[PDB]
Amino acid sequence: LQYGPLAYILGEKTTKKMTENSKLITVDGNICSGKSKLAKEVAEKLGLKHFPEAGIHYADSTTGDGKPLPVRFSGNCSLEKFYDDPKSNDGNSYRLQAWLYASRLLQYADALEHLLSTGQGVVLERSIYSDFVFLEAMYRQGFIRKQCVDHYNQVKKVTVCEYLPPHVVIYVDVPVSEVQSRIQKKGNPHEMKITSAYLQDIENVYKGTFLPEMSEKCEVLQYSAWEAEDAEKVVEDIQYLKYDKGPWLDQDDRKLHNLRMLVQDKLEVLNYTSIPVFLPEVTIGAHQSDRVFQEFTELPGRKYRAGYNEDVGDKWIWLK
């Protein structure tokens, strides 16, 4: 552990490195709002680190060699199977939603750690505060059951209270008709199987339950499809904001020290993701879990710790 109470005692305060550009900016929108590149555009104006949107294999890219592991080890779910079969009997929809929520939580922890450790601002896409807008969009379409929503609400309630909201949230307004036009334009074959009612429900829960929810905890900026093409106007708007709302103002060095100690422990971050609630969508039996774990240990560079793997060519093991 390179950071802890001892480094804080000797003088490594996080308020010494936080500048005026050290802001957490989250760019939102629909599934084809064109928000993606826009975030990258922000990332090439204020010198902020750009984290891409967390998929199934984000944690596989974070750890190990960075390669995506096979799907039986990470996720055990498919996005294409969800698009083709939104009402599957194996519970792929809620399993994918829970895995995506865990990946978004890990990405938010990594972003907070980078911001509190280096003082450089971070641009994210679709943080944990904007993941339930998919979940209800599943449940309002009859894709999942009510107990899945109860389990998701329990997990979110017990794990979202320990973090801080972003400084700026950016929303891109694109209608569902132009969204389906873009979907036909790209040509990913499983993506035309999505329905217009799903996108309409996504937009409805974006506008009625999300923007009023964090109107007060952060500064909200909404753009349409042609205001988003100009990044200079966007960075001019975010550079002229007076941050006087939310809980980011009353942050002492002790509170940020506690937050940095929290986000650097990845097992503590994911402690409450696997709560012992037995739902058929997420519960994995004993024999299957044993077999999959035994397969996972046999992967190269995975049996031991990150510096004690001889099969990948680590030396001086007997002195470590």
Binding site: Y304, R305, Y308, E310, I317, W318, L319, K320
Partner: protein
């Protein structure tokens, strides 16, 4: 029980009289057992942190064994000292009070009578 014995020289781990006793040998079975305990603790330390158990951290295992052997040697020396103190106090109290410990007339079996209970 021995609270009044170590009441005039308090907080002494090993007093001067403990130097009159033979020290434990370095090849003692108890010292070897304590060293084995230290080696087992080193192996557990390797195991719970996902390391090669018999391979990683030879210096840490050696430090475990050495520290365990050191502490065990001092504890064994104190243990034999306190048992010697117990025996010395017992023999002194027996010698000082001869009337409370009378020698018994040790009869042979030609004079004593034991009841016979047949098994049949």
């Amino acid at each position: 029980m021995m609270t009044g014995r170590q009441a005039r020289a308090p907080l002494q781990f090993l007093p001067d009289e403990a130097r009159s006793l033979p020290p434990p040998k370095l090849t003692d079975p108890r010292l070897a057992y304590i060293g084995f305990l230290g080696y087992c603790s080193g192996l557990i330390d390797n195991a719970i942190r996902r390391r090669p158990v018999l391979s990683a951290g030879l210096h840490r295992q050696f430090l475990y064994i050495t520290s365990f052997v050191f502490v065990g040697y001092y504890l064994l020396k104190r243990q034999d000292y306190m048992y010697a103190v117990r025996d010395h106090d017992m023999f002194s109290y027996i010698k000082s009070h001869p009337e409370d410990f009378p020698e018994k007339d040790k009869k042979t079996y030609r004079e004593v009578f034991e009841e016979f209970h047949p098994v049949r």
